[PDB]
Symmetry: D2
Subunit: 95 residues, 4 copies
């Protein structure tokens, strides 16, 4: 289930305007990505945030969050493809 996929798209755009907002978005993304996670959450919430404030670190912190969101989308995406492609191969072994 890729609800997360659609949310990444929308969350991606908000990534630009004129820091609480930035920190807020990252948090949203992580909560939606967690859904249900086992204690593995530690790694996902192990100082998994942007680095802090001066404008420099806000230009920086905001770039970090564009790549993070693109990464999730394409990681999810290629993994999803692997899945479809593996099931096909496994089947091509029918013969």
């Amino acid at each position: 289930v890729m609800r997360i996929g659609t949310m990444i798209k929308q969350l991606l755009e908000e990534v630009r305007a004129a820091r609480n907002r930035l920190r807020d978005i990252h948090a949203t993304s992580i909560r939606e990505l967690e859904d249900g996670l086992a204690p593995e959450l530690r790694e996902e919430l192990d100082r998994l945030t942007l680095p802090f404030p001066s404008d420099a670190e806000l230009r920086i912190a905001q770039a970090q969050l564009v790549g993070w969101l693109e990464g999730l989308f394409h990681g999810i995406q290629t993994a999803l493809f692997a899945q479809q492609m593996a099931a096909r191969a496994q089947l091509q072994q029918m013969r």
Copy 2:
């Protein structure tokens, strides 16, 4: 495979963490995208349509580096959660067939 993709990433991520240029950060990025486009048609058009992080200045580098960390980290956890979801969906479907 998907394991091959993850382990390289873990590596590219450590390769950037300790950095100084304009060719290093651009290569790490190319490298990562070279790994994903393991036979997936023209959707490669999404990654191969640039999507590259924006004598260069010093501050400009830091900003670009930060974006790379997210890209590399995003790909890692994006895969990870696609995997866990795949595993949970099979779990559920098994319990539906209680018998």
Copy 3:
């Protein structure tokens, strides 16, 4: 879906278990195959190429009924183990990415 397939089977299996004809056992079979060929090209040629269990005698019926039980049971557990394998492969792949 795959859950839809399993639950119908559980039902067809109980529909045969308590039987007396030559049209009942043939319908239960048709029914099961009608369920599998949920949009899968010409591989339907495998199931739709007869593959039907062999005024008929009495003993002949018992033999045919037994074969149906295996077919219905086979489809159930065949799915079940494809599901568990799918779930285990995702599990493993997750543990490879220890970090």
Copy 4:
């Protein structure tokens, strides 16, 4: 992993010749299908065998084992297809 798939094919043919052999094959099939199974094995080994001896019950018991093996193959097969098809749909949601 569909090793089981290839074994079903081979095990399927042995299904005809001229009861220990019959009972032996079913057992083989179940062991190869178990690989690793959780306590769920009970259901798979809950009087999951052919019914016993007179020829009548050997014609019968052997028919049961042809369908069982065909069933496993096509159950595994369609489930495998579902898998590939679901991963594709989930992806078609990218847009």
